[PDB]
Amino acid sequence: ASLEDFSIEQLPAKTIYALGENIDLTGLNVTGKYDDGKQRPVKVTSEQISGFSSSVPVDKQEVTITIEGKQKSFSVHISPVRVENGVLTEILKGYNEIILPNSVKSIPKDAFRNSQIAKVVLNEGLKSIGDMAFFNSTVQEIVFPSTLEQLKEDIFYYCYNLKKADLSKTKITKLPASTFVYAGIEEVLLPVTLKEIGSQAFLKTSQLKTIEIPENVSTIGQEAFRESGITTVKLPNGVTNIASRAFYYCPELAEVTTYGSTFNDDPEAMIHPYCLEGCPKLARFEIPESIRILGQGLLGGNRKVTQLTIPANVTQINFSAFNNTGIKEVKVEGTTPPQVFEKVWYGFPDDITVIRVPAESVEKYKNANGWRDFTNKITTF
Ligand SMILES: [Cl-]
Ligand SMILES: [Cl-]
Ligand SMILES: [Cl-]
Ligand SMILES: [Cl-]
Ligand SMILES: [Cl-]
DSSP: OOEEEEEEEEOOSOOEEETTOOOOOTTOEEEEEETTSOEEEOOOOGGGEESOOOSSOEEEEEEEEEETTEEEEEEEEEESEEEETTEEEEEOSSOSEEEOOTTOOEEOTTTTTTOOOSEEEOOTTOOEEOTTTTTTOOOOEEEOOTTOOEEOSSTTTTOTTOOEEEOTTSOOSEEOTTTTTTOOOSEEEOOTTOOEEOTTTTTTOTTOOEEEOOTTOOEEOTTTTTTOOOSEEEEETTOOEEOTTTTTTOTTOOEEEEESSOOOOOTTOEEOTTTTTTOTTOOEEOOOTTOOEEOTTTTTTOOSOOEEEEOTTOOEEOTTSSSSSOOOEEEEOOSSOOBOOOSSOOOSOTTOOEEEEOGGGHHHHHHSTTGGGGGGGEEEO
16 A cells, blocks of 8 residues: 555646745646555645745756655746736846736736847736836846737837737737837737727838738727838728828838728718828728718829729718729719718819719719719719
8 A cells, every 4th residue: 555656637827937936836737646556636735845935036947846755847937027916027137038927917018118028928817017028128028828808008109120010819808008019020820809090009110021801990090000010901891980191101011902791880970081181002992881981182193003992881971082083983882972061073084985884873973963063974874
């Protein structure tokens, strides 16, 4: 009935510790093999443990289990951070890479402000990141966890070396205002839970090559992609609010395309004024199916977009919406002409070639306010 050997069946759930944290054996499962032929679970306590210490940072620390003179080891990692009541309260200086312990529930405001770190691996269990958390940090790479649900503003503001932000597995519902202003991000992946992009979130992201807006986003904040380096944009059809100057002065923006079957019935749904003004390379522009109103000067100054389709949901086109453009051919899909509330519309260019509308609606369009200004250019699909 003497112990002959023992096996570590399951390691403790916590193997990444903050400085000054005691070991936690929850989840540790040890099986003992005895001289009477029986295998039994063995209760492991502090009395059977040696080699644990969270006094200094250690990449790989060997923790030994001793039972009846027999020994087996497992590794822990001591991170150069302090955590109080789930809050990351301190970060030691001079560490190029930090792996957050399992105990971090929140990162407070300015935690990594002006940090010289290269890489941060955020932990499973992390729920929120506070204001300016990585403001003007030299951080090059961040591993985000599936439990991240809340963000405050200006987190990666001035993060010139942050090449990528993969948030696709997080649960965030809002990307706050000014998240990546002047950041060096080349690519950003957003989760299915995302509903809105805050104001100036990608302001002056000169290296951001593209953007794919995920399926459940309804709102794109004011000047969200102003002066970004984005070459292409993908929008779900369920987008209802594209705020003013959202893609303002994007010098490399070549196309804005829509996708999917998402649809939101919202009477305020609108592409707000001067949304894609100052985009000279824009040559393909598509409107999401959920849009109800087309604001003023949406493509102001552009000459490369020659074709435009007005989706069937559009019920209103505002003053001088598309007149200062190179649009030659328009397809209006609605059987009821979009309403014009202006006496002088300036809706489309005087140099337009054709407006194609449903065959059964040609007379309605020819006699409708605004649309009647282009009666000579109105024909069927
Ligand atoms: Cl390091
Ligand atoms: Cl670390
Ligand atoms: Cl916002
Ligand atoms: Cl709806
Ligand atoms: Cl215009």
